[PDB]
Amino acid sequence: TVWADEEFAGRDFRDEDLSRIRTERVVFTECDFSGVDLSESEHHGSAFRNCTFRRSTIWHSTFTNCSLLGSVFTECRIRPVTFVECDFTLAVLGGCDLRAVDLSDCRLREVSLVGADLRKAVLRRADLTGSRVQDARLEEADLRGTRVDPTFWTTAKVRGAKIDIEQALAYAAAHGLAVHG
Amino acid sequence: TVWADEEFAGRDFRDEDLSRIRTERVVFTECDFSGVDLSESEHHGSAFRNCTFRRSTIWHSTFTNCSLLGSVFTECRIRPVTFVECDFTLAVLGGCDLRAVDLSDCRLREVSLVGADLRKAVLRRADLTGSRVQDARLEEADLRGTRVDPTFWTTAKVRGAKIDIEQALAYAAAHGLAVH
Structure with missing residues (x-):
């Protein structure tokens, strides 16, 4: 069919x-x-x-x-x-099992990922702005190139996640560091 | 005299x-x-x-x-x-009050700063490697150019601290991010 x-x-x-x-x-x-x-x-x-x-x-x-x-x-x-x-x-997608899923180049604006499991997911060059990520598991996810709100870095569990330079600077700033240069 | x-x-x-x-x-x-x-x-x-x-x-x-x-x-x-x-x-210098003190370009290698107060201290281009910073207060300190151990970023209280690009990358890495 x-x-x-x-x-x-x-x-x-x-x-x-x-x-x-x-x-x-x-x-x-x-x-x-x-x-x-x-x-x-x-x-x-x-x-x-x-x-x-x-x-x-x-x-x-x-x-x-x-x-x-x-x-x-x-x-x-x-x-x-x-x-x-x-x-x-x-x-x-609250509470959904998305472990090791590839959402590269996907638009994920204002998505609910509350308590979602994204461990080892591939989220390269995605857009996650406005997304609700309370209790979201992003451990060892690949986030390189992905647009996220500053709040993402203090909300989602990102230990072991792969990030780029811009994301690393944003992570520090989101934790209250005054980043210069 | x-x-x-x-x-x-x-x-x-x-x-x-x-x-x-x-x-x-x-x-x-x-x-x-x-x-x-x-x-x-x-x-x-x-x-x-x-x-x-x-x-x-x-x-x-x-x-x-x-x-x-x-x-x-x-x-x-x-x-x-x-x-x-x-x-x-x-x-x-454990427990010492060093608030707003300028230690720019000073060597602070393997110093004890346990429970030291360095809030708003100016620590530009200092060397803090090997230092013990358990319970050290570095809120709103200026750390730009300062050498610190990776562990500094997960041990010292650094909210509001002024840091540079290299320090920000090291902060992320010290918290378990894989920076590429």
């Missing part, structure tokens, strides 16, 4: 089997995917706007150039997964 | 009034300055090696190109004071 160049709104998909579906430039607006099986699905240029993925399974899926704007992923089985240049603006 | 080009070893100066004395290239070795008034004194190129200044007063003194090697400053009234390019190697 392949869905292409079309739009679905307010649809109830609860506990449906959508395993191995392909979408190309499909828009899902306010759809309920609670408990749905999306195992091994594949999405190219598609959009999931304010959709609910509570207790759904999206593992083994591939999303390229997709939007997840405002969608909710509480207790979603995500990993392993492939995200290529995706937009997660305002998505809720 | 002006002493010059003299060496004093194992001298008891306890509770003597040495206020406004001047010394030029005088060596004091294992001299006891406990409870001495050394207020408003002046020292150029003098050495105080393994001397005790316990409970002494040295405030409003000037020390230029002086060595304090291994000397003990416990409960000494130090500040305010002028130190110019002095060497404090292995001195004991």
